[PDB]
Amino acid sequence: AIPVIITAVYSVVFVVGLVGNSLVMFVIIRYTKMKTATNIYIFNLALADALVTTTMPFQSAVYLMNSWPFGDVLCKIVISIDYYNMFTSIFTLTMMSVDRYIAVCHPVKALDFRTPLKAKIINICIWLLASSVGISAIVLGGTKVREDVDVIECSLQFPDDEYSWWDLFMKICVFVFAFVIPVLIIIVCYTLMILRLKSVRLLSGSREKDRNLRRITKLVLVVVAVFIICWTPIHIFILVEALGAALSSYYFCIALGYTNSSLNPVLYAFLDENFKRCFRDFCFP
Ligand SMILES: CCn1cc(CN2[C@H]3C=C(c4cccc(O)c4)[C@](C)(C[C@@H]3C(=O)OC)[C@H]2C)cn1
Numbered sequence: 001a002i003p004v005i006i007t008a009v010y011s012v013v014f015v016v017g018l019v020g021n022s023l024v025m026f027v028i029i030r031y032t033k034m035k036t037a038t039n040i041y042i043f044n045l046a047l048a049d050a051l052v053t054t055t056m057p058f059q060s061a062v063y064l065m066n067s068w069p070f071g072d073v074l075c076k077i078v079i080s081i082d083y084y085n086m087f088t089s090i091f092t093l094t095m096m097s098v099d100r101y102i103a104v105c106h107p108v109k110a111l112d113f114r115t116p117l118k119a120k121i122i123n124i125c126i127w128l129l130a131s132s133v134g135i136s137a138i139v140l141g142g143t144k145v146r147e148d149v150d151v152i153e154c155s156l157q158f159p160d161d162e163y164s165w166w167d168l169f170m171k172i173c174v175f176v177f178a179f180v181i182p183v184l185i186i187i188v189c190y191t192l193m194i195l196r197l198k199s200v201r202l203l204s205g206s207r208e209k210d211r212n213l214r215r216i217t218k219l220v221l222v223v224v225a226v227f228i229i230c231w232t233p234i235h236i237f238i239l240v241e242a243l244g245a246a247l248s249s250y251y252f253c254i255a256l257g258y259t260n261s262s263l264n265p266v267l268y269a270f271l272d273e274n275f276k277r278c279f280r281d282f283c284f285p
Contacts, residue, residue, distance in 0.1 A: 006255050007060050013262045014056035020265030021050035027278040034274055038216055040119035041096045042268070044126065045089060045223075049261035052085035056258070063251065068154040072143050075154035079141035080134045085261070086231075087130035087178055093227055094182040095122055096220050101189040103213060105196050133174075171242040179235045186224055193217060219271040226267065230260035 024046040028039050055078050058070055068075060099119075103110045142157040158166035197214065204210050234253040241250075268275040 010060040017262030021046040037119035044123040076141040080137040097189040
């Protein structure tokens with residue numbers, strides 16, 4: 001047991017992920033060159049990641065001291081931000097996959113569909129949809145003291161009359177509606193996309209547009225794959241704990257889930273040429 005490992009990971013996230021996501025958002029907002037629908041979805045992803053990053057110093061307290069000293073309102077805000085990030089990230093990735101599928105397999109409709117204004121509207125709709133869980137976490141979140149160890153715990157406060165089916169039902173619903181169905185949609189979309197790419201890879205000829213499409217599809221696929229492997233262990237662990245060394249695995253899964261918020265810019269800078277150019281221009285004008 002050495003507390004500086006996960007705490008150092010949390011601090012590295014708290015600084016680097018915040019800086020990178022802020023740079024991504026600033027670059028997307030400023031440059032008219034990079035105001036594209038996929039870039040708008042990337043902006044939403046970076047916004048969620050930066051929002052979840054600000055709560056990193058509060059997250060590390062329940063690991064350093066195993067108690068919540070920040071109060072009820074801060075507990076509510078932190079829980080709401082966590083649920084907002086979890087739902088918004090997966091929904092935005094699903095919409096990115098759908099947009100890529102439309103661009104690749106239905107170019108006739110993608111002209112009307114893939115305008116940046118529709119991307120902004122879809123981002124607002126995604127934030128509103130996830131608010132059904134964020135506002136619920138605001139209402140239900142709270143701090144309850146432990147009567148056996150005098151430890152303050154920050155968690156959702158289901159009625160103590162049942163507080164059992166409630167927790168299991170909410171965990172199952174979160175699993176189904178934030179992991180299973182969106183991942184199924186992403187898998188279907190990318191299976192069709194890969195089929196289309198293989199079909200025309202032999203003799204496609206619109207060099208500039210084909211290259212651009214294949215590069216953005218690559219970038220989106222890599223981002224989705226990184227998210228899936230970063231958030232897969234925590235979902236399975238939560239489901240197993242609800243239904244069925246353990247604490248070490250739990251905290252490792254939690255830490256791995258949070259590090260995904262910092263790897264998005266270090267992926268954009270390597271998978272996209274325009275993002276790399278803009279990062280260089282900002283760092284070294
Ligand atoms: C600092 C360590 N710590 C974190 C917590 C609680 N968090 C972690 C686990 C949860 C979760 C995740 C997936 C499915 C599910 O049903 C619940 C949260 C809703 C999101 C956090 C996370 O995993 O994002 C990497 C939240 C209550 C308690 N201690």
